[PDB]
Amino acid sequence: MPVKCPGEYQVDGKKVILDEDCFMQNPEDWDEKVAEWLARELEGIQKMTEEHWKLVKYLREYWETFGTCPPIKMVTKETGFSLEKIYQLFPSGPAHGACKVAGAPKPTGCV
């Protein structure tokens, strides 16, 4: 693993905590520096393009209705994104990838 999780870190006067599997467990202090930070340590992106913040923004709005993270095939019904382009933008897995950069804690595992 790239980041020794779980582990804590500091970014621009801020506190980011990472639980098992490097999961965001502090959506209260999420910002542009935190999202771009984890994305830079994982994908290596040094400058969040306009597409990353675009999809990341649409998801941030749906997380204010129930608090979950759907896939990327249903968001297209009201957006216009191509699964191919998103694939080259993410490491083959825009599902958990996007939500992760957004700062959404797991829904309800336990099985």
PDB file of all heavy atoms in Angstrom, residues 34-72:
ATOM      1  N   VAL A  34      -7.413  18.543   0.445  1.00  0.00           N
ATOM      2  CA  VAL A  34      -7.502  17.125   0.897  1.00  0.00           C
ATOM      3  C   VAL A  34      -7.826  16.212  -0.288  1.00  0.00           C
ATOM      4  O   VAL A  34      -7.157  15.226  -0.525  1.00  0.00           O
ATOM      5  CB  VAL A  34      -8.641  17.104   1.917  1.00  0.00           C
ATOM      6  CG1 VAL A  34      -8.647  15.760   2.647  1.00  0.00           C
ATOM      7  CG2 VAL A  34      -8.437  18.233   2.930  1.00  0.00           C
ATOM      8  N   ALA A  35      -8.846  16.534  -1.036  1.00  0.00           N
ATOM      9  CA  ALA A  35      -9.210  15.686  -2.207  1.00  0.00           C
ATOM     10  C   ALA A  35      -8.036  15.610  -3.185  1.00  0.00           C
ATOM     11  O   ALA A  35      -7.654  14.546  -3.632  1.00  0.00           O
ATOM     12  CB  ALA A  35     -10.402  16.392  -2.851  1.00  0.00           C
ATOM     13  N   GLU A  36      -7.460  16.731  -3.522  1.00  0.00           N
ATOM     14  CA  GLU A  36      -6.310  16.724  -4.471  1.00  0.00           C
ATOM     15  C   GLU A  36      -5.100  16.041  -3.827  1.00  0.00           C
ATOM     16  O   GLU A  36      -4.254  15.490  -4.502  1.00  0.00           O
ATOM     17  CB  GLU A  36      -6.012  18.199  -4.743  1.00  0.00           C
ATOM     18  CG  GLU A  36      -4.978  18.312  -5.866  1.00  0.00           C
ATOM     19  CD  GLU A  36      -3.575  18.117  -5.290  1.00  0.00           C
ATOM     20  OE1 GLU A  36      -3.166  18.941  -4.488  1.00  0.00           O
ATOM     21  OE2 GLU A  36      -2.934  17.147  -5.659  1.00  0.00           O
ATOM     22  N   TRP A  37      -5.013  16.072  -2.525  1.00  0.00           N
ATOM     23  CA  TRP A  37      -3.860  15.424  -1.838  1.00  0.00           C
ATOM     24  C   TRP A  37      -3.923  13.905  -2.021  1.00  0.00           C
ATOM     25  O   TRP A  37      -3.032  13.301  -2.587  1.00  0.00           O
ATOM     26  CB  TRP A  37      -4.019  15.792  -0.363  1.00  0.00           C
ATOM     27  CG  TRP A  37      -2.972  15.091   0.442  1.00  0.00           C
ATOM     28  CD1 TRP A  37      -1.648  15.360   0.396  1.00  0.00           C
ATOM     29  CD2 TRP A  37      -3.138  14.012   1.408  1.00  0.00           C
ATOM     30  NE1 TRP A  37      -0.989  14.516   1.272  1.00  0.00           N
ATOM     31  CE2 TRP A  37      -1.864  13.667   1.920  1.00  0.00           C
ATOM     32  CE3 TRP A  37      -4.259  13.306   1.885  1.00  0.00           C
ATOM     33  CZ2 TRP A  37      -1.709  12.658   2.871  1.00  0.00           C
ATOM     34  CZ3 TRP A  37      -4.107  12.289   2.843  1.00  0.00           C
ATOM     35  CH2 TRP A  37      -2.833  11.966   3.334  1.00  0.00           C
ATOM     36  N   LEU A  38      -4.970  13.285  -1.550  1.00  0.00           N
ATOM     37  CA  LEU A  38      -5.090  11.806  -1.699  1.00  0.00           C
ATOM     38  C   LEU A  38      -5.017  11.418  -3.178  1.00  0.00           C
ATOM     39  O   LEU A  38      -4.420  10.423  -3.540  1.00  0.00           O
ATOM     40  CB  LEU A  38      -6.462  11.461  -1.120  1.00  0.00           C
ATOM     41  CG  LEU A  38      -6.288  10.633   0.153  1.00  0.00           C
ATOM     42  CD1 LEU A  38      -7.571  10.700   0.985  1.00  0.00           C
ATOM     43  CD2 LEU A  38      -5.997   9.179  -0.219  1.00  0.00           C
ATOM     44  N   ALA A  39      -5.619  12.197  -4.036  1.00  0.00           N
ATOM     45  CA  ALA A  39      -5.584  11.872  -5.491  1.00  0.00           C
ATOM     46  C   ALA A  39      -4.151  11.975  -6.021  1.00  0.00           C
ATOM     47  O   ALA A  39      -3.764  11.274  -6.936  1.00  0.00           O
ATOM     48  CB  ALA A  39      -6.477  12.920  -6.152  1.00  0.00           C
ATOM     49  N   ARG A  40      -3.359  12.843  -5.452  1.00  0.00           N
ATOM     50  CA  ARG A  40      -1.950  12.990  -5.924  1.00  0.00           C
ATOM     51  C   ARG A  40      -1.096  11.835  -5.397  1.00  0.00           C
ATOM     52  O   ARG A  40      -0.188  11.370  -6.056  1.00  0.00           O
ATOM     53  CB  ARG A  40      -1.474  14.320  -5.340  1.00  0.00           C
ATOM     54  CG  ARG A  40       0.000  14.531  -5.685  1.00  0.00           C
ATOM     55  CD  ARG A  40       0.655  15.411  -4.616  1.00  0.00           C
ATOM     56  NE  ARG A  40       0.903  16.714  -5.291  1.00  0.00           N
ATOM     57  CZ  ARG A  40       1.279  17.750  -4.594  1.00  0.00           C
ATOM     58  NH1 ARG A  40       2.357  17.686  -3.861  1.00  0.00           N
ATOM     59  NH2 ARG A  40       0.577  18.849  -4.628  1.00  0.00           N
ATOM     60  N   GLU A  41      -1.377  11.371  -4.211  1.00  0.00           N
ATOM     61  CA  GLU A  41      -0.579  10.248  -3.642  1.00  0.00           C
ATOM     62  C   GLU A  41      -1.007   8.919  -4.273  1.00  0.00           C
ATOM     63  O   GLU A  41      -0.241   7.979  -4.341  1.00  0.00           O
ATOM     64  CB  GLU A  41      -0.895  10.257  -2.146  1.00  0.00           C
ATOM     65  CG  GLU A  41       0.289  10.847  -1.378  1.00  0.00           C
ATOM     66  CD  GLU A  41      -0.009  10.811   0.123  1.00  0.00           C
ATOM     67  OE1 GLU A  41      -0.808  11.617   0.569  1.00  0.00           O
ATOM     68  OE2 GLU A  41       0.569   9.977   0.801  1.00  0.00           O
ATOM     69  N   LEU A  42      -2.227   8.833  -4.726  1.00  0.00           N
ATOM     70  CA  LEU A  42      -2.706   7.560  -5.343  1.00  0.00           C
ATOM     71  C   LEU A  42      -2.502   7.585  -6.861  1.00  0.00           C
ATOM     72  O   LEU A  42      -1.728   6.823  -7.404  1.00  0.00           O
ATOM     73  CB  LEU A  42      -4.196   7.496  -5.005  1.00  0.00           C
ATOM     74  CG  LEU A  42      -4.432   6.430  -3.935  1.00  0.00           C
ATOM     75  CD1 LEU A  42      -4.158   7.026  -2.551  1.00  0.00           C
ATOM     76  CD2 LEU A  42      -5.884   5.953  -4.004  1.00  0.00           C
ATOM     77  N   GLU A  43      -3.200   8.446  -7.550  1.00  0.00           N
ATOM     78  CA  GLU A  43      -3.053   8.509  -9.033  1.00  0.00           C
ATOM     79  C   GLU A  43      -1.796   9.294  -9.420  1.00  0.00           C
ATOM     80  O   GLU A  43      -1.172   9.025 -10.426  1.00  0.00           O
ATOM     81  CB  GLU A  43      -4.307   9.233  -9.524  1.00  0.00           C
ATOM     82  CG  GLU A  43      -5.389   8.207  -9.866  1.00  0.00           C
ATOM     83  CD  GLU A  43      -6.595   8.412  -8.949  1.00  0.00           C
ATOM     84  OE1 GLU A  43      -6.388   8.777  -7.802  1.00  0.00           O
ATOM     85  OE2 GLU A  43      -7.706   8.203  -9.408  1.00  0.00           O
ATOM     86  N   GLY A  44      -1.424  10.267  -8.634  1.00  0.00           N
ATOM     87  CA  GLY A  44      -0.211  11.065  -8.967  1.00  0.00           C
ATOM     88  C   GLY A  44      -0.633  12.405  -9.573  1.00  0.00           C
ATOM     89  O   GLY A  44       0.186  13.261  -9.845  1.00  0.00           O
ATOM     90  N   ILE A  45      -1.907  12.595  -9.789  1.00  0.00           N
ATOM     91  CA  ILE A  45      -2.382  13.880 -10.378  1.00  0.00           C
ATOM     92  C   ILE A  45      -1.826  15.066  -9.587  1.00  0.00           C
ATOM     93  O   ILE A  45      -2.075  15.208  -8.406  1.00  0.00           O
ATOM     94  CB  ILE A  45      -3.905  13.828 -10.264  1.00  0.00           C
ATOM     95  CG1 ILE A  45      -4.438  12.642 -11.073  1.00  0.00           C
ATOM     96  CG2 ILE A  45      -4.503  15.126 -10.810  1.00  0.00           C
ATOM     97  CD1 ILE A  45      -5.778  12.189 -10.492  1.00  0.00           C
ATOM     98  N   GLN A  46      -1.079  15.920 -10.229  1.00  0.00           N
ATOM     99  CA  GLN A  46      -0.511  17.098  -9.513  1.00  0.00           C
ATOM    100  C   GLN A  46      -1.483  18.278  -9.589  1.00  0.00           C
ATOM    101  O   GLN A  46      -1.491  19.144  -8.737  1.00  0.00           O
ATOM    102  CB  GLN A  46       0.786  17.424 -10.255  1.00  0.00           C
ATOM    103  CG  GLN A  46       1.625  16.153 -10.402  1.00  0.00           C
ATOM    104  CD  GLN A  46       2.996  16.511 -10.980  1.00  0.00           C
ATOM    105  OE1 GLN A  46       3.426  15.933 -11.958  1.00  0.00           O
ATOM    106  NE2 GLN A  46       3.706  17.446 -10.409  1.00  0.00           N
ATOM    107  N   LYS A  47      -2.301  18.318 -10.604  1.00  0.00           N
ATOM    108  CA  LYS A  47      -3.273  19.442 -10.736  1.00  0.00           C
ATOM    109  C   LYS A  47      -4.653  18.904 -11.126  1.00  0.00           C
ATOM    110  O   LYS A  47      -4.893  18.548 -12.262  1.00  0.00           O
ATOM    111  CB  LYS A  47      -2.707  20.325 -11.848  1.00  0.00           C
ATOM    112  CG  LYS A  47      -2.474  19.481 -13.103  1.00  0.00           C
ATOM    113  CD  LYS A  47      -3.206  20.114 -14.288  1.00  0.00           C
ATOM    114  CE  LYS A  47      -2.323  20.035 -15.535  1.00  0.00           C
ATOM    115  NZ  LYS A  47      -2.660  21.253 -16.323  1.00  0.00           N
ATOM    116  N   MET A  48      -5.560  18.843 -10.190  1.00  0.00           N
ATOM    117  CA  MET A  48      -6.924  18.329 -10.507  1.00  0.00           C
ATOM    118  C   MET A  48      -7.461  19.000 -11.774  1.00  0.00           C
ATOM    119  O   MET A  48      -7.622  20.203 -11.830  1.00  0.00           O
ATOM    120  CB  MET A  48      -7.778  18.703  -9.297  1.00  0.00           C
ATOM    121  CG  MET A  48      -7.763  17.555  -8.285  1.00  0.00           C
ATOM    122  SD  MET A  48      -8.644  16.131  -8.975  1.00  0.00           S
ATOM    123  CE  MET A  48     -10.214  16.401  -8.117  1.00  0.00           C
ATOM    124  N   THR A  49      -7.738  18.231 -12.792  1.00  0.00           N
ATOM    125  CA  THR A  49      -8.264  18.827 -14.055  1.00  0.00           C
ATOM    126  C   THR A  49      -9.705  19.303 -13.857  1.00  0.00           C
ATOM    127  O   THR A  49     -10.205  19.355 -12.751  1.00  0.00           O
ATOM    128  CB  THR A  49      -8.209  17.692 -15.080  1.00  0.00           C
ATOM    129  OG1 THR A  49      -9.170  16.703 -14.738  1.00  0.00           O
ATOM    130  CG2 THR A  49      -6.812  17.070 -15.082  1.00  0.00           C
ATOM    131  N   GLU A  50     -10.377  19.648 -14.922  1.00  0.00           N
ATOM    132  CA  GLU A  50     -11.785  20.121 -14.795  1.00  0.00           C
ATOM    133  C   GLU A  50     -12.744  18.926 -14.762  1.00  0.00           C
ATOM    134  O   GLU A  50     -13.863  19.030 -14.302  1.00  0.00           O
ATOM    135  CB  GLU A  50     -12.031  20.970 -16.042  1.00  0.00           C
ATOM    136  CG  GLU A  50     -12.181  22.438 -15.638  1.00  0.00           C
ATOM    137  CD  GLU A  50     -10.857  23.169 -15.866  1.00  0.00           C
ATOM    138  OE1 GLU A  50     -10.260  22.961 -16.909  1.00  0.00           O
ATOM    139  OE2 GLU A  50     -10.462  23.924 -14.992  1.00  0.00           O
ATOM    140  N   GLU A  51     -12.314  17.794 -15.247  1.00  0.00           N
ATOM    141  CA  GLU A  51     -13.202  16.596 -15.244  1.00  0.00           C
ATOM    142  C   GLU A  51     -13.267  15.988 -13.839  1.00  0.00           C
ATOM    143  O   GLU A  51     -14.323  15.646 -13.348  1.00  0.00           O
ATOM    144  CB  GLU A  51     -12.552  15.618 -16.222  1.00  0.00           C
ATOM    145  CG  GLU A  51     -12.884  16.033 -17.657  1.00  0.00           C
ATOM    146  CD  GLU A  51     -12.239  17.387 -17.958  1.00  0.00           C
ATOM    147  OE1 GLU A  51     -11.030  17.423 -18.116  1.00  0.00           O
ATOM    148  OE2 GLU A  51     -12.965  18.365 -18.025  1.00  0.00           O
ATOM    149  N   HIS A  52     -12.143  15.852 -13.189  1.00  0.00           N
ATOM    150  CA  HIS A  52     -12.140  15.266 -11.819  1.00  0.00           C
ATOM    151  C   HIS A  52     -13.098  16.041 -10.910  1.00  0.00           C
ATOM    152  O   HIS A  52     -13.960  15.470 -10.270  1.00  0.00           O
ATOM    153  CB  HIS A  52     -10.700  15.412 -11.328  1.00  0.00           C
ATOM    154  CG  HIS A  52      -9.831  14.386 -12.004  1.00  0.00           C
ATOM    155  ND1 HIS A  52      -8.522  14.669 -12.411  1.00  0.00           N
ATOM    156  CD2 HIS A  52     -10.061  13.074 -12.354  1.00  0.00           C
ATOM    157  CE1 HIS A  52      -8.021  13.550 -12.976  1.00  0.00           C
ATOM    158  NE2 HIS A  52      -8.923  12.580 -12.955  1.00  0.00           N
ATOM    159  N   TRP A  53     -12.953  17.335 -10.845  1.00  0.00           N
ATOM    160  CA  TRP A  53     -13.853  18.145  -9.976  1.00  0.00           C
ATOM    161  C   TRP A  53     -15.282  18.120 -10.523  1.00  0.00           C
ATOM    162  O   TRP A  53     -16.241  18.255  -9.786  1.00  0.00           O
ATOM    163  CB  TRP A  53     -13.281  19.563 -10.024  1.00  0.00           C
ATOM    164  CG  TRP A  53     -12.197  19.695  -9.003  1.00  0.00           C
ATOM    165  CD1 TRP A  53     -10.976  20.229  -9.234  1.00  0.00           C
ATOM    166  CD2 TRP A  53     -12.213  19.298  -7.601  1.00  0.00           C
ATOM    167  NE1 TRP A  53     -10.240  20.184  -8.063  1.00  0.00           N
ATOM    168  CE2 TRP A  53     -10.959  19.620  -7.028  1.00  0.00           C
ATOM    169  CE3 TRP A  53     -13.184  18.695  -6.779  1.00  0.00           C
ATOM    170  CZ2 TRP A  53     -10.680  19.353  -5.687  1.00  0.00           C
ATOM    171  CZ3 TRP A  53     -12.907  18.425  -5.429  1.00  0.00           C
ATOM    172  CH2 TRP A  53     -11.656  18.754  -4.885  1.00  0.00           C
ATOM    173  N   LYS A  54     -15.436  17.947 -11.807  1.00  0.00           N
ATOM    174  CA  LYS A  54     -16.808  17.912 -12.393  1.00  0.00           C
ATOM    175  C   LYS A  54     -17.598  16.741 -11.802  1.00  0.00           C
ATOM    176  O   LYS A  54     -18.569  16.928 -11.095  1.00  0.00           O
ATOM    177  CB  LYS A  54     -16.593  17.712 -13.894  1.00  0.00           C
ATOM    178  CG  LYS A  54     -17.316  18.820 -14.664  1.00  0.00           C
ATOM    179  CD  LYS A  54     -17.168  18.580 -16.168  1.00  0.00           C
ATOM    180  CE  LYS A  54     -17.603  19.832 -16.931  1.00  0.00           C
ATOM    181  NZ  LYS A  54     -16.353  20.356 -17.551  1.00  0.00           N
ATOM    182  N   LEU A  55     -17.186  15.535 -12.082  1.00  0.00           N
ATOM    183  CA  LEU A  55     -17.910  14.355 -11.531  1.00  0.00           C
ATOM    184  C   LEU A  55     -17.893  14.404 -10.002  1.00  0.00           C
ATOM    185  O   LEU A  55     -18.888  14.155  -9.352  1.00  0.00           O
ATOM    186  CB  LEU A  55     -17.134  13.140 -12.041  1.00  0.00           C
ATOM    187  CG  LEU A  55     -17.967  11.876 -11.826  1.00  0.00           C
ATOM    188  CD1 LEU A  55     -18.899  11.670 -13.020  1.00  0.00           C
ATOM    189  CD2 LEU A  55     -17.035  10.669 -11.694  1.00  0.00           C
ATOM    190  N   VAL A  56     -16.767  14.728  -9.424  1.00  0.00           N
ATOM    191  CA  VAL A  56     -16.685  14.800  -7.938  1.00  0.00           C
ATOM    192  C   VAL A  56     -17.738  15.777  -7.405  1.00  0.00           C
ATOM    193  O   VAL A  56     -18.230  15.636  -6.303  1.00  0.00           O
ATOM    194  CB  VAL A  56     -15.278  15.316  -7.644  1.00  0.00           C
ATOM    195  CG1 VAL A  56     -15.196  15.775  -6.187  1.00  0.00           C
ATOM    196  CG2 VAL A  56     -14.264  14.194  -7.881  1.00  0.00           C
ATOM    197  N   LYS A  57     -18.085  16.765  -8.182  1.00  0.00           N
ATOM    198  CA  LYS A  57     -19.105  17.752  -7.726  1.00  0.00           C
ATOM    199  C   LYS A  57     -20.504  17.136  -7.799  1.00  0.00           C
ATOM    200  O   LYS A  57     -21.271  17.203  -6.859  1.00  0.00           O
ATOM    201  CB  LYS A  57     -18.985  18.924  -8.702  1.00  0.00           C
ATOM    202  CG  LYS A  57     -18.400  20.137  -7.976  1.00  0.00           C
ATOM    203  CD  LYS A  57     -18.640  21.396  -8.812  1.00  0.00           C
ATOM    204  CE  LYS A  57     -17.719  22.516  -8.326  1.00  0.00           C
ATOM    205  NZ  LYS A  57     -17.849  23.591  -9.348  1.00  0.00           N
ATOM    206  N   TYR A  58     -20.840  16.535  -8.908  1.00  0.00           N
ATOM    207  CA  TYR A  58     -22.192  15.916  -9.039  1.00  0.00           C
ATOM    208  C   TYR A  58     -22.429  14.914  -7.905  1.00  0.00           C
ATOM    209  O   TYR A  58     -23.505  14.838  -7.347  1.00  0.00           O
ATOM    210  CB  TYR A  58     -22.171  15.201 -10.391  1.00  0.00           C
ATOM    211  CG  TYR A  58     -23.570  14.754 -10.744  1.00  0.00           C
ATOM    212  CD1 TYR A  58     -24.340  15.503 -11.642  1.00  0.00           C
ATOM    213  CD2 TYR A  58     -24.096  13.586 -10.174  1.00  0.00           C
ATOM    214  CE1 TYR A  58     -25.638  15.087 -11.969  1.00  0.00           C
ATOM    215  CE2 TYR A  58     -25.394  13.170 -10.500  1.00  0.00           C
ATOM    216  CZ  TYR A  58     -26.164  13.922 -11.398  1.00  0.00           C
ATOM    217  OH  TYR A  58     -27.442  13.512 -11.721  1.00  0.00           O
ATOM    218  N   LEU A  59     -21.432  14.144  -7.562  1.00  0.00           N
ATOM    219  CA  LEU A  59     -21.602  13.149  -6.465  1.00  0.00           C
ATOM    220  C   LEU A  59     -21.781  13.863  -5.121  1.00  0.00           C
ATOM    221  O   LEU A  59     -22.552  13.443  -4.282  1.00  0.00           O
ATOM    222  CB  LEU A  59     -20.310  12.332  -6.469  1.00  0.00           C
ATOM    223  CG  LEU A  59     -20.556  10.988  -7.159  1.00  0.00           C
ATOM    224  CD1 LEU A  59     -19.915  11.001  -8.547  1.00  0.00           C
ATOM    225  CD2 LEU A  59     -19.937   9.866  -6.322  1.00  0.00           C
ATOM    226  N   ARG A  60     -21.072  14.938  -4.912  1.00  0.00           N
ATOM    227  CA  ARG A  60     -21.200  15.676  -3.623  1.00  0.00           C
ATOM    228  C   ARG A  60     -22.648  16.126  -3.407  1.00  0.00           C
ATOM    229  O   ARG A  60     -23.102  16.268  -2.289  1.00  0.00           O
ATOM    230  CB  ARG A  60     -20.277  16.887  -3.768  1.00  0.00           C
ATOM    231  CG  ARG A  60     -20.467  17.821  -2.571  1.00  0.00           C
ATOM    232  CD  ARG A  60     -21.563  18.841  -2.888  1.00  0.00           C
ATOM    233  NE  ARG A  60     -21.154  20.080  -2.171  1.00  0.00           N
ATOM    234  CZ  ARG A  60     -21.707  20.386  -1.028  1.00  0.00           C
ATOM    235  NH1 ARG A  60     -21.276  19.834   0.073  1.00  0.00           N
ATOM    236  NH2 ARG A  60     -22.692  21.242  -0.989  1.00  0.00           N
ATOM    237  N   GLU A  61     -23.375  16.353  -4.467  1.00  0.00           N
ATOM    238  CA  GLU A  61     -24.791  16.796  -4.318  1.00  0.00           C
ATOM    239  C   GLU A  61     -25.682  15.609  -3.940  1.00  0.00           C
ATOM    240  O   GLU A  61     -26.547  15.714  -3.094  1.00  0.00           O
ATOM    241  CB  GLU A  61     -25.183  17.342  -5.691  1.00  0.00           C
ATOM    242  CG  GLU A  61     -26.537  18.048  -5.593  1.00  0.00           C
ATOM    243  CD  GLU A  61     -26.374  19.520  -5.975  1.00  0.00           C
ATOM    244  OE1 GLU A  61     -25.290  20.045  -5.784  1.00  0.00           O
ATOM    245  OE2 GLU A  61     -27.336  20.097  -6.454  1.00  0.00           O
ATOM    246  N   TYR A  62     -25.477  14.479  -4.560  1.00  0.00           N
ATOM    247  CA  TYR A  62     -26.313  13.288  -4.235  1.00  0.00           C
ATOM    248  C   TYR A  62     -26.030  12.813  -2.807  1.00  0.00           C
ATOM    249  O   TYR A  62     -26.868  12.215  -2.164  1.00  0.00           O
ATOM    250  CB  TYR A  62     -25.899  12.221  -5.248  1.00  0.00           C
ATOM    251  CG  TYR A  62     -26.985  11.178  -5.349  1.00  0.00           C
ATOM    252  CD1 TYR A  62     -28.210  11.498  -5.948  1.00  0.00           C
ATOM    253  CD2 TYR A  62     -26.769   9.889  -4.841  1.00  0.00           C
ATOM    254  CE1 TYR A  62     -29.220  10.530  -6.039  1.00  0.00           C
ATOM    255  CE2 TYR A  62     -27.780   8.921  -4.933  1.00  0.00           C
ATOM    256  CZ  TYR A  62     -29.005   9.243  -5.532  1.00  0.00           C
ATOM    257  OH  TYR A  62     -29.998   8.289  -5.622  1.00  0.00           O
ATOM    258  N   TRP A  63     -24.852  13.073  -2.308  1.00  0.00           N
ATOM    259  CA  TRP A  63     -24.517  12.633  -0.923  1.00  0.00           C
ATOM    260  C   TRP A  63     -25.274  13.485   0.102  1.00  0.00           C
ATOM    261  O   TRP A  63     -25.185  13.262   1.292  1.00  0.00           O
ATOM    262  CB  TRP A  63     -23.009  12.850  -0.790  1.00  0.00           C
ATOM    263  CG  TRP A  63     -22.497  12.076   0.380  1.00  0.00           C
ATOM    264  CD1 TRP A  63     -22.406  10.727   0.439  1.00  0.00           C
ATOM    265  CD2 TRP A  63     -22.006  12.576   1.658  1.00  0.00           C
ATOM    266  NE1 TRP A  63     -21.889  10.368   1.671  1.00  0.00           N
ATOM    267  CE2 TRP A  63     -21.626  11.471   2.458  1.00  0.00           C
ATOM    268  CE3 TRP A  63     -21.852  13.869   2.195  1.00  0.00           C
ATOM    269  CZ2 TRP A  63     -21.114  11.643   3.746  1.00  0.00           C
ATOM    270  CZ3 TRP A  63     -21.337  14.046   3.491  1.00  0.00           C
ATOM    271  CH2 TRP A  63     -20.970  12.934   4.263  1.00  0.00           C
ATOM    272  N   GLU A  64     -26.018  14.455  -0.352  1.00  0.00           N
ATOM    273  CA  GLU A  64     -26.779  15.317   0.599  1.00  0.00           C
ATOM    274  C   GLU A  64     -28.259  14.922   0.604  1.00  0.00           C
ATOM    275  O   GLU A  64     -29.096  15.621   1.139  1.00  0.00           O
ATOM    276  CB  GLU A  64     -26.605  16.741   0.070  1.00  0.00           C
ATOM    277  CG  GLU A  64     -25.963  17.613   1.151  1.00  0.00           C
ATOM    278  CD  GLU A  64     -25.087  18.681   0.494  1.00  0.00           C
ATOM    279  OE1 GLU A  64     -25.519  19.246  -0.497  1.00  0.00           O
ATOM    280  OE2 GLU A  64     -23.999  18.915   0.993  1.00  0.00           O
ATOM    281  N   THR A  65     -28.587  13.805   0.013  1.00  0.00           N
ATOM    282  CA  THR A  65     -30.011  13.365  -0.014  1.00  0.00           C
ATOM    283  C   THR A  65     -30.197  12.133   0.875  1.00  0.00           C
ATOM    284  O   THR A  65     -31.116  12.059   1.665  1.00  0.00           O
ATOM    285  CB  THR A  65     -30.291  13.021  -1.477  1.00  0.00           C
ATOM    286  OG1 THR A  65     -29.372  13.715  -2.310  1.00  0.00           O
ATOM    287  CG2 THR A  65     -31.720  13.432  -1.837  1.00  0.00           C
ATOM    288  N   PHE A  66     -29.331  11.165   0.751  1.00  0.00           N
ATOM    289  CA  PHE A  66     -29.456   9.939   1.589  1.00  0.00           C
ATOM    290  C   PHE A  66     -28.117   9.620   2.259  1.00  0.00           C
ATOM    291  O   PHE A  66     -28.069   9.129   3.370  1.00  0.00           O
ATOM    292  CB  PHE A  66     -29.845   8.829   0.611  1.00  0.00           C
ATOM    293  CG  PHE A  66     -30.555   7.726   1.359  1.00  0.00           C
ATOM    294  CD1 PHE A  66     -31.950   7.626   1.300  1.00  0.00           C
ATOM    295  CD2 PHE A  66     -29.818   6.803   2.113  1.00  0.00           C
ATOM    296  CE1 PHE A  66     -32.611   6.602   1.994  1.00  0.00           C
ATOM    297  CE2 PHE A  66     -30.477   5.779   2.808  1.00  0.00           C
ATOM    298  CZ  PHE A  66     -31.874   5.680   2.748  1.00  0.00           C
ATOM    299  N   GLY A  67     -27.029   9.897   1.593  1.00  0.00           N
ATOM    300  CA  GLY A  67     -25.695   9.611   2.193  1.00  0.00           C
ATOM    301  C   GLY A  67     -25.165   8.281   1.652  1.00  0.00           C
ATOM    302  O   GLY A  67     -24.846   7.380   2.402  1.00  0.00           O
ATOM    303  N   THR A  68     -25.065   8.153   0.357  1.00  0.00           N
ATOM    304  CA  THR A  68     -24.553   6.880  -0.228  1.00  0.00           C
ATOM    305  C   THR A  68     -23.630   7.175  -1.413  1.00  0.00           C
ATOM    306  O   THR A  68     -23.215   8.298  -1.625  1.00  0.00           O
ATOM    307  CB  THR A  68     -25.802   6.129  -0.695  1.00  0.00           C
ATOM    308  OG1 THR A  68     -26.442   6.872  -1.722  1.00  0.00           O
ATOM    309  CG2 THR A  68     -26.761   5.949   0.481  1.00  0.00           C
ATOM    310  N   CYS A  69     -23.307   6.176  -2.188  1.00  0.00           N
ATOM    311  CA  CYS A  69     -22.412   6.399  -3.360  1.00  0.00           C
ATOM    312  C   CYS A  69     -22.718   5.380  -4.460  1.00  0.00           C
ATOM    313  O   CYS A  69     -22.187   4.286  -4.459  1.00  0.00           O
ATOM    314  CB  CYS A  69     -20.996   6.199  -2.821  1.00  0.00           C
ATOM    315  SG  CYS A  69     -20.069   7.747  -2.965  1.00  0.00           S
ATOM    316  N   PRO A  70     -23.570   5.776  -5.365  1.00  0.00           N
ATOM    317  CA  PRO A  70     -23.958   4.889  -6.488  1.00  0.00           C
ATOM    318  C   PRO A  70     -22.811   4.767  -7.494  1.00  0.00           C
ATOM    319  O   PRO A  70     -21.803   5.435  -7.371  1.00  0.00           O
ATOM    320  CB  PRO A  70     -25.155   5.605  -7.111  1.00  0.00           C
ATOM    321  CG  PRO A  70     -24.981   7.044  -6.743  1.00  0.00           C
ATOM    322  CD  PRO A  70     -24.246   7.077  -5.426  1.00  0.00           C
ATOM    323  N   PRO A  71     -23.004   3.910  -8.459  1.00  0.00           N
ATOM    324  CA  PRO A  71     -21.974   3.692  -9.502  1.00  0.00           C
ATOM    325  C   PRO A  71     -21.921   4.886 -10.459  1.00  0.00           C
ATOM    326  O   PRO A  71     -22.374   5.967 -10.143  1.00  0.00           O
ATOM    327  CB  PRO A  71     -22.456   2.436 -10.222  1.00  0.00           C
ATOM    328  CG  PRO A  71     -23.933   2.396  -9.989  1.00  0.00           C
ATOM    329  CD  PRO A  71     -24.191   3.075  -8.667  1.00  0.00           C
ATOM    330  N   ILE A  72     -21.370   4.698 -11.626  1.00  0.00           N
ATOM    331  CA  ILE A  72     -21.289   5.822 -12.602  1.00  0.00           C
ATOM    332  C   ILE A  72     -22.200   5.550 -13.802  1.00  0.00           C
ATOM    333  O   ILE A  72     -22.249   6.316 -14.743  1.00  0.00           O
ATOM    334  CB  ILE A  72     -19.825   5.863 -13.038  1.00  0.00           C
ATOM    335  CG1 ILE A  72     -19.652   6.898 -14.152  1.00  0.00           C
ATOM    336  CG2 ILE A  72     -19.408   4.486 -13.554  1.00  0.00           C
ATOM    337  CD1 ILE A  72     -20.225   8.240 -13.697  1.00  0.00           C
TER     338      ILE A  72
END
